[PDB]
Design a protein around this nucleic acid. Sequence first.
DNA 1: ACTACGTAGT
DNA 2: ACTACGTAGT
Lengths: 148, 148
Amino acid sequence: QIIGTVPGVEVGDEFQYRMELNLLGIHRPSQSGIDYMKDDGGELVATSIVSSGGYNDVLDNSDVLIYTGQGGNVGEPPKDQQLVTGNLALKNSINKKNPVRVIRGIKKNYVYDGLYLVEEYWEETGSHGKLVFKFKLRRIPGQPELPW
Amino acid sequence: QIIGTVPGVEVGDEFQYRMELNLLGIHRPSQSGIDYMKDDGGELVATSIVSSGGYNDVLDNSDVLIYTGQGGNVGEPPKDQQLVTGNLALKNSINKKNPVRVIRGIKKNYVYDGLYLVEEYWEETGSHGKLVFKFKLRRIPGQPELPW
DNA sequence: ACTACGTAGT
DNA sequence: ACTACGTAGT
């Protein structure tokens, strides 16, 4: 479990499978969009996220990404998302200011996008009355650009 | 889709993931235990099976393997297995006498076991009143032995 | 749409 | 036990 850059993995590197992300220490979960670990202390912090067509993420070709919290049956019946696990880790990552690897799903299937910081999160009341989290992430300046 | 030996894959070769079986043309399905294809004609025939702790397969260290049909919620509520798809392909493979690759799940995760022929199948009435298929497969003589 | 002898992590 | 922004094939 490593925070920040992973040796031998360059911005722009592409992968066919989630399991390659795991083999290379980029992103461990087989399906989950958020990976996290405990820091110096009991607190969870996020290490990497995957945005691949789930959940109405907002990805333009700018430095800012809006990333939807996991769960609540968003993207069984609708229910409130919960500030635990990966959602809570992303939140905590706001205070820690730790880098977070971002992998983006591409319609060969995944690209490493570089490091981002989580700048804030908020709650939204979906079209169903249920809570959804949104995390605003900003790419750290100085990284190679990606074409899209 | 190839019947029989796959170039560069030796009896005794091991693999961590089902997806490596697929990449190498050993076994295509991501989860399904039976892979099949159409032959000269409209008929399905089996090309490979995976025995990995599902379904009460009978695997001793002999040349004969008893392989359970798929479905029926065996290994939702219990229901009759059906002679279609992979089950039907294995059955048809009795008449075709075509080789069938056998991969065995090992408690790094999978081993290629060599080629077998399907010699017969039968039906069994499980402890639930529902039908289950059993296929008897016999390893073709002349192949390297595996330790167990 | 839907079946599937998958997987990792907590 | 249970969650999960997986997958391939038909």
